[PDB]
Amino acid sequence: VNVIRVMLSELFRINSHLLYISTFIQDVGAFFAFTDRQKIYDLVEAITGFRMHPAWFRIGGVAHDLPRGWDRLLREFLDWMPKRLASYEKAALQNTILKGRSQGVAAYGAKEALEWGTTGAGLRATGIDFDVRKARPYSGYENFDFEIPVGGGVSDCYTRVMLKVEELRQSLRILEQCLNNMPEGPFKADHPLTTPPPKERTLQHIETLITHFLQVSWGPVMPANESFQMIEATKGINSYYLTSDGSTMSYRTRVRTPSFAHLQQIPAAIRGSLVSDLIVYLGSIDFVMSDVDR
Amino acid sequence: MATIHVDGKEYEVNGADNLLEACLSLGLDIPYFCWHPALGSVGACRQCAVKQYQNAEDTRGRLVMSCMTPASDGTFISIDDEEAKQFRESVVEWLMTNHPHDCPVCEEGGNCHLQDMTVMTGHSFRRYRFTKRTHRNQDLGPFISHEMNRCIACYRCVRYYKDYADGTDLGVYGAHDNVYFGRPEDGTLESEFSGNLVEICPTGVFTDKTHSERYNRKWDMQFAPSICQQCSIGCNISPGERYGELRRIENRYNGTVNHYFLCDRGRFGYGYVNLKDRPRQPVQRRGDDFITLNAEQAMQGAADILRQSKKVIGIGSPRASVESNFALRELVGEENFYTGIAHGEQERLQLALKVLREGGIYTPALREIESYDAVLVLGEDVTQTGARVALAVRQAVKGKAREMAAAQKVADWQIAAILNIGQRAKHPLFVTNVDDTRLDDIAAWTYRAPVEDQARLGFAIAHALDNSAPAVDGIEPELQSKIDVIVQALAGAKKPLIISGTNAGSLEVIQAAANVAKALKGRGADVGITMIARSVNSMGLGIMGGGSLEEALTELETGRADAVVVLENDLHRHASAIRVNAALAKAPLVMVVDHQRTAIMENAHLVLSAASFAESDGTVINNEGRAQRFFQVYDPAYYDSKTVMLESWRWLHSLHSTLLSREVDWTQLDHVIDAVVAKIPELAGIKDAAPDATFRIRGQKLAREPHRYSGRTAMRANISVHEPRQPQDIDTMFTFSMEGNNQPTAHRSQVPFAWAPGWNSPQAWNKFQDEVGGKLRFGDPGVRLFETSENGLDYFTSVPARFQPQDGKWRIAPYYHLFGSDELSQRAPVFQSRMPQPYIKLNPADAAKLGVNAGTRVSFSYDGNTVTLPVEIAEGLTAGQVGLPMGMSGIAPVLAGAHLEDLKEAQ
Amino acid sequence: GGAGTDFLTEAHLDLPMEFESIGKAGSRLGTALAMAVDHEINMVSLVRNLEEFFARESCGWCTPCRDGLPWSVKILRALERGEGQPGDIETLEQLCRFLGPGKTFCAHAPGAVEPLQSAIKYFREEFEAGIKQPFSNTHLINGIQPNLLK
Amino acid sequence: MYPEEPVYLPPRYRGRIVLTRDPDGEERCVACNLCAVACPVGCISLQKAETKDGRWYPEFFRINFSRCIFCGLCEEACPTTAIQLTPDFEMGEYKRQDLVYEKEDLLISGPGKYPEYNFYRMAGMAIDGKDKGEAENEAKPIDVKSLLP
Ligand code: SF4
Ligand code: SF4
Numbered sequence A: 001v002n003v004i005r006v007m008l009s010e011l012f013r014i015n016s017h018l019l020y021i022s023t024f025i026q027d028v029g030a031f032f033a034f035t036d037r038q039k040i041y042d043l044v045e046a047i048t049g050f051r052m053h054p055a056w057f058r059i060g061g062v063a064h065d066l067p068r069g070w071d072r073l074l075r076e077f078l079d080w081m082p083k084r085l086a087s088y089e090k091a092a093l094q095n096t097i098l099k100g101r102s103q104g105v106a107a108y109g110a111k112e113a114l115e116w117g118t119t120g121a122g123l124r125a126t127g128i129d130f131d132v133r134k135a136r137p138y139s140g141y142e143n144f145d146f147e148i149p150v151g152g153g154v155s156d157c158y159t160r161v162m163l164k165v166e167e168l169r170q171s172l173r174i175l176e177q178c179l180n181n182m183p184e185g186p187f188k189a190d191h192p193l194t195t196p197p198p199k200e201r202t203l204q205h206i207e208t209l210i211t212h213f214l215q216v217s218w219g220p221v222m223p224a225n226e227s228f229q230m231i232e233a234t235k236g237i238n239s240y241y242l243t244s245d246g247s248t249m250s251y252r253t254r255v256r257t258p259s260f261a262h263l264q265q266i267p268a269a270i271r272g273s274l275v276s277d278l279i280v281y282l283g284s285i286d287f288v289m290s291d292v293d294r
Numbered sequence B: 001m002a003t004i005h006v007d008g009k010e011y012e013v014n015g016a017d018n019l020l021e022a023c024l025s026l027g028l029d030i031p032y033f034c035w036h037p038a039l040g041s042v043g044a045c046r047q048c049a050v051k052q053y054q055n056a057e058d059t060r061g062r063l064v065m066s067c068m069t070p071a072s073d074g075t076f077i078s079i080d081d082e083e084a085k086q087f088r089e090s091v092v093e094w095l096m097t098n099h100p101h102d103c104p105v106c107e108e109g110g111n112c113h114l115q116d117m118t119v120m121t122g123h124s125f126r127r128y129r130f131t132k133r134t135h136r137n138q139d140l141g142p143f144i145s146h147e148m149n150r151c152i153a154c155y156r157c158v159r160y161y162k163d164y165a166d167g168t169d170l171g172v173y174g175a176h177d178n179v180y181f182g183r184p185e186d187g188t189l190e191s192e193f194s195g196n197l198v199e200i201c202p203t204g205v206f207t208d209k210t211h212s213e214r215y216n217r218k219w220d221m222q223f224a225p226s227i228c229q230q231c232s233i234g235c236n237i238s239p240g241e242r243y244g245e246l247r248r249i250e251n252r253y254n255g256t257v258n259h260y261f262l263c264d265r266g267r268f269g270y271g272y273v274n275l276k277d278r279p280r281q282p283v284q285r286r287g288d289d290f291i292t293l294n295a296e297q298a299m300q301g302a303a304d305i306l307r308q309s310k311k312v313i314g315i316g317s318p319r320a321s322v323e324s325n326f327a328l329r330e331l332v333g334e335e336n337f338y339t340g341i342a343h344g345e346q347e348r349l350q351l352a353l354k355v356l357r358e359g360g361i362y363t364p365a366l367r368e369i370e371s372y373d374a375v376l377v378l379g380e381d382v383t384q385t386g387a388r389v390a391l392a393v394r395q396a397v398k399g400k401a402r403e404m405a406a407a408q409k410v411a412d413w414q415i416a417a418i419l420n421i422g423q424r425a426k427h428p429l430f431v432t433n434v435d436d437t438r439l440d441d442i443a444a445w446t447y448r449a450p451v452e453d454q455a456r457l458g459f460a461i462a463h464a465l466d467n468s469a470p471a472v473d474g475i476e477p478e479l480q481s482k483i484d485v486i487v488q489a490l491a492g493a494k495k496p497l498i499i500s501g502t503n504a505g506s507l508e509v510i511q512a513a514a515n516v517a518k519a520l521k522g523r524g525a526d527v528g529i530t531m532i533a534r535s536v537n538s539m540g541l542g543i544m545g546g547g548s549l550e551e552a553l554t555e556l557e558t559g560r561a562d563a564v565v566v567l568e569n570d571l572h573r574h575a576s577a578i579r580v581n582a583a584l585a586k587a588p589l590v591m592v593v594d595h596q597r598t599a600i601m602e603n604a605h606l607v608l609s610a611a612s613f614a615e616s617d618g619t620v621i622n623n624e625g626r627a628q629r630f631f632q633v634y635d636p637a638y639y640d641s642k643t644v645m646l647e648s649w650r651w652l653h654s655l656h657s658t659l660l661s662r663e664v665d666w667t668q669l670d671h672v673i674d675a676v677v678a679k680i681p682e683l684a685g686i687k688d689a690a691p692d693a694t695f696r697i698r699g700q701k702l703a704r705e706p707h708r709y710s711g712r713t714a715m716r717a718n719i720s721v722h723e724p725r726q727p728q729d730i731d732t733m734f735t736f737s738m739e740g741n742n743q744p745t746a747h748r749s750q751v752p753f754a755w756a757p758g759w760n761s762p763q764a765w766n767k768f769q770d771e772v773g774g775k776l777r778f779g780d781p782g783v784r785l786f787e788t789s790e791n792g793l794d795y796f797t798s799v800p801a802r803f804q805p806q807d808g809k810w811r812i813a814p815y816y817h818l819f820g821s822d823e824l825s826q827r828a829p830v831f832q833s834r835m836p837q838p839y840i841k842l843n844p845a846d847a848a849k850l851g852v853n854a855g856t857r858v859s860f861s862y863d864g865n866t867v868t869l870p871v872e873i874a875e876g877l878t879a880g881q882v883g884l885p886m887g888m889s890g891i892a893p894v895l896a897g898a899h900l901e902d903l904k905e906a907q
Numbered sequence C: 001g002g003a004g005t006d007f008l009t010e011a012h013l014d015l016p017m018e019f020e021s022i023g024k025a026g027s028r029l030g031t032a033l034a035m036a037v038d039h040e041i042n043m044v045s046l047v048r049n050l051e052e053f054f055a056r057e058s059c060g061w062c063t064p065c066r067d068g069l070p071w072s073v074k075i076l077r078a079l080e081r082g083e084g085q086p087g088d089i090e091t092l093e094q095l096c097r098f099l100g101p102g103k104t105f106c107a108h109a110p111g112a113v114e115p116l117q118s119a120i121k122y123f124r125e126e127f128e129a130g131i132k133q134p135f136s137n138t139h140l141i142n143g144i145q146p147n148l149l150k
Numbered sequence D: 001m002y003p004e005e006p007v008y009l010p011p012r013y014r015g016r017i018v019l020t021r022d023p024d025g026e027e028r029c030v031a032c033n034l035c036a037v038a039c040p041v042g043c044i045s046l047q048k049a050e051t052k053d054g055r056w057y058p059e060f061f062r063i064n065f066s067r068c069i070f071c072g073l074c075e076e077a078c079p080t081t082a083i084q085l086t087p088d089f090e091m092g093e094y095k096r097q098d099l100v101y102e103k104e105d106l107l108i109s110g111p112g113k114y115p116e117y118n119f120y121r122m123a124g125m126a127i128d129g130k131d132k133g134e135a136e137n138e139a140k141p142i143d144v145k146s147l148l149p
């Protein structure tokens, strides 16, 4: 489950970065995401049955097991991106228009990143090496060999985009280890509170049928406690502060999203610049208003 | 009382309790099945296992059963001990070995204690690979369904049906793992309290067939705290609705009234609410043309005729609420308001009230009845009129065993021991009726005699207990000997209980009971008096008062009254149909406000579509004088927008406003309640019966729907894909939604339904009570309107003369049926089979004299009408008396005490 | 001394027939009417017979004895038919501990597991020969990939 | 391209929801209301009904596809493999009221993605065809009046 949940996450991490890098380059400079993004969606669709909103992960595992043939699709994608990525960086590296319009725009250092809660490429561009996947390992990420792209002290529009390109290469590396080291065993935990329980047993065993009935009806009863898990998302550190009062529904679901903080730093980072600079900055910040407003 | 140590934490508990009861009452969760807060502890399923240590230094304790272990001081137990957890999971696994895979198709799914415990024990993996035992099911009648495959052998049904309800048709058969729980043969369960099995059984072996027809899961039910309307006991119920139809009636725990048990009439007699012939919109009769009007049009037009009416009289009903009856009284004037009851019935009801309100003797609550040590029932067939009181009398009779066991220092929860120590020993019980009663099995003596002779016995017992009491003449030496046994039993009792009522049809039987109770009070005894009425708000109408139906008819007959507004009353159950129909035909305007299609509606000029208890909110007063409020369960116009079924008080209040201001006023319930408390000081407690509509829990309204209610965006999609607006409630503190509060710790007393995380079964009431089996944590709902008076009434000196058979005349003796005597319950379709076939009962000798045998149809004339009925032979019935099923359509309850004339073989 | 007593070996034949001596040996004196088992008798089939009796003589009051003993009989019958699956002996041992004194309502089951626990203690090899098949309580539902527990 | 060139949808594609039938041709639905409660939008409404034999079935089954998010929580919740999301994406309509499908627009004539599963062969509740003791891993009823000890 750890490796499956990492694999799906890195597929979507690439998908989001591709779109972000493509859009920035299209507007600021002069990298077709559609084609590469479709290949990812095809694997995700084969595994989840859906594209943008998989809703596959479950409390204790993933809704189903990997579909037979997933390895073939993944290998094909891991043999197509290598070259496509080479084209993505070359552009940014040699697009003088991009470099000229992006370098030294909306620049901020470590102090500004820390005071405004900036996380992700922005924080790393300031030179602070803080990636939750390495700082606070989760989902068995500690079992993967990858490097965190870090900047040199200045978080400008160009440095932010360049780190996102270097992240794609590291994500492809994790996806290769997932493909060659996919463990054999359960896709759902063997815990009384795994929801829903393995369907094959639910369809043939009364004890598992009873557990399923209640978990899909009144809901899974979570004992009273407070939990918190922060993860390195596609746009920065995203966390879920959950509070249970011992019921089948949350008493409080706090979702800390990186985009909300990145939009509050804009006034301090763009003051004194021109509107043209603001539009480039807005692009360099990988952000979606759904993450900001929730 | 005692200090226990559970999992290290220290707790103060009652040493007289068992660890299960104690820990459950502390909020600690221990799985269980065989134990029930009312059936005691037996130690069968072995599920409540807890590790017990001898001291604080013991590290190797023993697995004991919390239900069979005293909560003694210095007790060290652990529920989270690994061995205890493993054993508790193993017990569930053993029960799952032979358990059917029928969750999706069983009616306990989502309300099953077994499902709740499987999950609580954390057993989700099956290791058993062998075959599962199967059992063939049986027919148990029209109310309960059988599915023995889903059994776990906890023995709860047999312990409740036979050791608590004293039934004789349920039993345990077979041995080892082939134990079977059911009837000795296929047939209808005969216990009037058989329905409680559906909530007692922790699985789905016993289910409710009345619901199975239109079954829905508990999470999809809209529930509201309501009071049962089938008799005068006033049991708290939780009616549930889905798709605009009352689906099921469940028990609402009232630690002061019905606690955990209802009776079959209230649990399965609600189908009348789902009848499709019920009025739904206001309709006006123009000659032979019927016009459906709207609320506004109906009010304006009616007020126009009423404004030009010489005298508008109003007839109320014991079925209607206090607010509804009061609204009619204000609309027509107290001088023109008449209780739709016969003169005699009103006299008896008022006499019963005077005894309870001015007799100086305490009237016990339903649960308090189980604590008296001697009971005398004078003329009241409780089992068929106030069934829940009969169940309470049964528990009271079982007190001797409990007293005997306490002398041997046996714990109160050890039922098995108490029963063995007791044997056939019981507290004295004496019942009087015109014939056999269902309480004859536990009664020391049953006096079968005419109502007059039954009363003479009461006056006699009173004279023997106090010579100052009026003496009776003509008591034969044989009876005197029997009277002495009753006198010594009541005299020897420390807490005697006298029970009478208005169902006997005699004022003397109520006066006799008052004399006996006064006699025992004079001898310094904790005497109790209980009076059984006939309907949900009989006592409420009695307190309000008014003219009789006969007087109301006379007004219409002299022509002095031109308009009659009848409220929820058929009038044919209280007066002759010929007289009522003729009187209603001489009235220029006849308006009927009822929620059921009655006969008088046929010739009514206007019929207002009133709401039933399910679609209305109001206050009813029980036999003990407790004012209890019922709340609307669902909005009748949610699915069908055309429906205009409004509460009777709202209809009448708006009409009164349109009559005085030509403007409609649909007021809130609280305003009407405030009017009643101001105008009638006697009905003042009704204000404290329940909080107002402004009551909130931390800002939240109380909720009616469970938090997992489904279909919100699809239930009405057929009518319109556009979801309707949540029906709004301005009358109560309940929301017609899930956006409210139903916490087990909410500082309230009105609980719509019982649900707690991990407890989806009726066992969830345990989390809403101060102590399991006790009272609601923040008090039980309901207020007694009157307290025991400082002074009592003088002895009644009117002893009747002995009954004498008269050639030609045949005294009508009152036979009541739990299934058939009530008006609304008889309308329910599922009751048709349970209801008795029409009959007349005759003394064997009288039948021989009339040369008729069992089955012979006999013709007789009452109100100038020849009726034919099959003859049944009743040996207990005295000669000169005929038996008729009171309340059964045709036989009006008023016939009690009347006389038949030309009784002869038909054809 | 009885079908409900724990089996002892030839080494225990030199022990006096007293309540304390047999108890320390690991059994109970019982009725003092002993029974001798020869080498030509299979312990699994013998205990299966004992359990079939103890299981059907149950009155059905408490779950441990009513639903636990019948399980053991099925496992023992499978073992004697060579259809035993891994985990059978462990279930038998768990039953012996969870059907012991204090757990059941009376001592019918506590004494019913006495012969079973002893036979597994001194003659486990006989119970092991029974397990010859792989464990499986689930069939393969087409369309649903199974959770492969390792 | 579309619509001339059809689109390959994977077998697990979460699209138009259909009600399926058992290998015996009977509807696999038992009207337990698990899919409905498990539904996060509340776009499923059904009512239980029973055949004279005792077989549970949906008297009516309504799915508002105007609110449906095609998440598959309902298909994951069936204990009977009746409700299934099929690989179909073309459900555009002119009036929203026509996005409210009934059993006539949901019950197909086959088993769907699950080819051979009958809950009624696992249940212990007797129906026409399966009597007490005729289900899987189920022993035949033993009468309490049997003479065998
Ligand atoms: S009794 Fe409870 S556990 Fe058994 S099939 Fe019915 S709902 Fe499921
Ligand atoms: S029928 Fe119900 S109450 Fe009776 S033994 Fe079975 S599970 Fe217990």
Ligand code: SF4
Pocket: B228, B229, B230, B231, B232, B233, B234, B235, B258, B262, B263, B264, B265, B266, B267, B385, B386, B387, B388, B389
């Ligand atoms: S005793 Fe009376 S109030 Fe109680 S449930 Fe029966 S009919 Fe209803």
Ligand code: SF4
Pocket: C057, C058, C059, C060, C061, C062, C063, C065, C066, C104, C105, C106, C107, C108, C109, C110
């Ligand atoms: S151990 Fe005793 S009480 Fe329990 S089932 Fe066996 S014989 Fe009955």
Ligand code: SF4
Pocket: B104, D028, D029, D030, D031, D032, D033, D034, D035, D036, D046, D077, D078, D079, D080, D081, D082, D083
């Ligand atoms: S579709 Fe499945 S989950 Fe929904 S009611 Fe039918 S059987 Fe139950």
Ligand code: SF4
Pocket: D017, D038, D039, D040, D041, D042, D043, D044, D063, D067, D068, D069, D070, D071, D072, D073, D074, D075
């Ligand atoms: S796919 Fe999701 S939204 Fe649609 S009916 Fe099923 S559970 Fe509800």
Ligand code: FES
Pocket: B020, B031, B032, B033, B034, B035, B042, B043, B044, B045, B046, B047, B048, B049, B065, B066, B067, B068
């Ligand atoms: S609840 Fe205690 S033994 Fe069953």
Ligand SMILES: [Ca+2]
Pocket: B615, B616, B617, B632, B647, B731, B732
């Ligand atoms: Ca209302």
Ligand SMILES: [Cl-]
Pocket: B453, B456, B474, B475, B476, B479, B802
């Ligand atoms: Cl007499």
